[PDB]
């Protein structure tokens, strides 16, 4: 089992969601704490997790939060502490999620699977792990998005790279 030395990830959540949040209906915004933003993707930086290079499994852990607001404060969604977990060419995108419903009532989703990952590329070696995966919204994620997306909705893809060490 190898430790994660430095990891980075890029994920836009969903391009059409970014456009909706900033557009004339939601009339909203996002703020970021420990997360960047560039080329329509949120930017994550972490130094924890572990990878099994022989079995091609692992977890890559990131700190930081994205906070979406809109609809006069009725929309209020936080996604924090994302984790990319993988076992072979499939995995899970896990995060701490809190989101308000269309009545303005906040619901805490715990540390939940936000989406299922299917890797189109995944390389794991002694010194590096990297890959790209489609992200399919989970049932809990659908509820957090106020049912505007069905479970199984394809979100933006997620990519990551990590240097590994410390066996
Ligand atoms: C008074 C409250 C709200 C009203 C009136 C409202 C209205 C709308 C309308 C008219 C649309 C576009 C039509 C559609 O895609 O079905 C939309 C899209 C959407 N709304 Fe809001 N909404 C509200 C609150 C919320 C909340 C609390 C969330 C939770 C995250 C949310 C998430 C979404 C999503 C995910 C979409 C789809 C955006 C896309 O990717 O195209 N909405 N909403
Ligand atoms: Na580490
Ligand atoms: Na894992």
TrEMBL record:
It comes from Corynebacterium glutamicum (strain ATCC 13032 / DSM 20300 / JCM 1318 / BCRC 11384 / CCUG 27702 / LMG 3730 / NBRC 12168 / NCIMB 10025 / NRRL B-2784 / 534). Signal peptide: none annotated. This is Hypothetical membrane protein. Heme b 2 binds at residues 16, 20, 148-149. Residues 7-161 form the Htaa domain.
């Amino acid at each position: 089992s190898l430790g994660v030395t430095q990891a980075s990830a890029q994920w836009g959540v969903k391009a059409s969601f970014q456009n909706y949040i900033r557009g004339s209906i939601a009339n909203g915004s996002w703020t970021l704490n420990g997360v960047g933003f560039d080329n329509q993707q949120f930017q994550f930086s972490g130094n924890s997790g572990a990878v099994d290079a022989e079995n091609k499994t692992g977890s890559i852990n990131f700190p930081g939060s994205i906070h979406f607001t809109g609809a006069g404060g009725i929309l209020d969604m936080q996604i924090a502490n994302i984790e990319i977990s993988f076992n072979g060419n499939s995995g899970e995108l896990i995060a701490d999620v809190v989101s308000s419903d269309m009545d303005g009532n906040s619901t805490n989703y715990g540390r939940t699977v936000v989406g299922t990952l299917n890797f189109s590329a995944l390389n794991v070696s002694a010194t590096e792990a990297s890959g790209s995966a489609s992200v399919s919204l989970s049932q809990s994620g659908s509820q957090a998005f106020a049912d505007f997306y069905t479970p199984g909705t394809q979100l933006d893809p997620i990519s990551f790279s990590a240097t590994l060490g410390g066996l």
